[PDB]
Amino acid sequence: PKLVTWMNNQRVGELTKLANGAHTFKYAPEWLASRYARPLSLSLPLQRGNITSDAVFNFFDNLLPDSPIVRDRIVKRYHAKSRQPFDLLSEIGRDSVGAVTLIPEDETIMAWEKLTEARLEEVLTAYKADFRISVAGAQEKTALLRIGNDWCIPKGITPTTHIIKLPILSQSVDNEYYCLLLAKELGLNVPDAEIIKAGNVRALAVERFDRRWNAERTVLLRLPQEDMCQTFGLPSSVKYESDGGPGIARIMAFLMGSSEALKDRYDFMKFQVFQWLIGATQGHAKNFSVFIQAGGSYRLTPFYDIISAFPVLGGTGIHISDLKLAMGLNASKGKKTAIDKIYPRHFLATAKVLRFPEVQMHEILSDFARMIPAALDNVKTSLPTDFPENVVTAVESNVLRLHGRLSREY
Ligand SMILES: [Cl-]
């Protein structure tokens, strides 16, 4: 059938699934007529006819969790017609990443339901074992609306405000909380987050940057954005560079066209050094996104889904020398990927071939060189008393070891 695509009460167009299985999208005339029109994706440019490219299927598929196990749970929950994407979005497409609201064609203000601690625990635990929310991730996360100090279920098409993550890596909630705090302390653009507790559940609540309250707090708006697989028209299956996905060079080139090119290229390169320092090995293409602005211009969103592989070291069998960056750097004979083998020279060499000013690359390295020690100390003040000590020890010790390569040079 057809899923009507809305962006904050404005009709954008309709998604169709053909009898032959193909997915097509058509923009609404009224959307195309606006002087402030913007495409749903840079892979789906504004145009009048039916769009039938694989970019249509890929774009909407990328709104859903990557995991087949998670999709099975979704079908079971809402009695979805099938496992196919169009049918999943027919059930949970009301509140998605970005501003796309999908509502069945056979269907015709701000309100919410406050959750008691008991009902919150109930709602959240239900995920490990008016609620049509879809979240893009690797595990099974959901979303809720925060009103003051209470967690709530939005009614109708009222949006959510926070992405909620449960433990994966049994300490992933604590791991990400720590990494988000550290990134913020070092000047990176990342969302604020908090550890929430509902009875026996411990989850991470991350503020959404694809949502914005108006000044009077009477309307909560959704903000359009898409991830790198979506912008390049790619399936989530190629999110890693080794599978054909975009790496540093492709993304840096794309950012030359951002409405904030200078700042975004600098922030993206700074984030590569940060990931190296904290041992983040899952910085694939879906971990980066851009806001789509009026007319189709774009700029990088904050970074997110940040987790260190350091707390997983030793434990089973993973060794420090086994940790690799998802997006490799330039090396004299190819690429440099091992965190334990990377030095300032690799970042400078990468900057050189990508036309990123050497003075800017030096500034980034020198800033981490003098700020890291104090930043690791400052984060402690924001950790609860029940925060796992092994996570702090693992990350701190390894960050300091690599930081030594920066301080010696700067
Ligand atoms: Cl290497």
From Swiss-Prot:
What is the reaction catalyzed?
Answer: L-seryl-[protein] + ATP = O-phospho-L-seryl-[protein] + ADP + H(+); L-threonyl-[protein] + ATP = O-phospho-L-threonyl-[protein] + ADP + H(+)
What residues are annotated to bind DNA?
352-355
Annotated coiled-coil segments of the chain: none
**Phenotypic consequence of gene deletion:** A hipA or a hipB-hipA operon deletion have no visible phenotype. Initially cells lacking hipA or the hipBA operon were thought not to produce persister cells at a high frequency; this was later shown to be a strain-specific phenotype. A hipA or a hipB-hipA operon deletion show decreased biofilm production in the absence of antibiotics.
Enumerate the InterPro entries for this protein.
HipA-like_C (IPR012893), HipA_N1 (IPR017508), HipA_Ser/Thr_kinase (IPR052028)
Superkingdom in the source lineage: Bacteria
What does the UniProt record report as the effect of altering D87N in this chain?
Answer: Loss of toxicity, still confers high levels of persister cells. Decreased affinity for HipB-operator
Q: What is the effect of changing S134A?
A: No phosphorylation; cells grow normally
Annotated GO biological processes are: dormancy process; regulation of DNA-templated transcription; regulation of growth; response to antibiotic; single-species biofilm formation
> Could you say what the effect of mutating D305Q is?
Loss of autophosphorylation; cells grow normally
- Keyword Repressor on this protein? yes
Q: Name one GO cellular component term.
A: toxin-antitoxin complex
Q: PTM Phosphoserine: at which residues?
A: S134
Q: Name one GO molecular function term.
A: sequence-specific DNA binding
Record EC number: 2.7.11.1
Q: Please tell me what else the database record remarks about this protein.
A: The hipA7 allele (G22S and D291A) as well as a P86L mutation have been identified in E.coli isolates from human patients with urinary tract infections, showing the mutations may be clinically relevant.
Q: What NCBIfam families has UniProt attached to this entry? A: couple_hipA
In UniProt terms, what function does this protein have? Answer: Toxic component of a type II toxin-antitoxin (TA) system, first identified by mutations that increase production of persister cells, a fraction of cells that are phenotypic variants not killed by antibiotics, which lead to multidrug tolerance. Persistence may be ultimately due to global remodeling of the persister cell's ribosomes. Phosphorylates Glu-tRNA-ligase (AC P04805, gltX, on 'Ser-239') in vivo. Phosphorylation of GltX prevents it from being charged, leading to an increase in uncharged tRNA(Glu).
PANTHER family, sorted: SERINE/THREONINE-PROTEIN KINASE TOXIN HIPA, SERINE_THREONINE-PROTEIN KINASE TOXIN HIPA
Family that this chain belongs to: Belongs to the HipA Ser/Thr kinase family.
Record's protein name: Serine/threonine-protein kinase toxin HipA
Q: What is the source species?
A: Escherichia coli (strain K12)
What is the primary gene name for this protein?
hipA
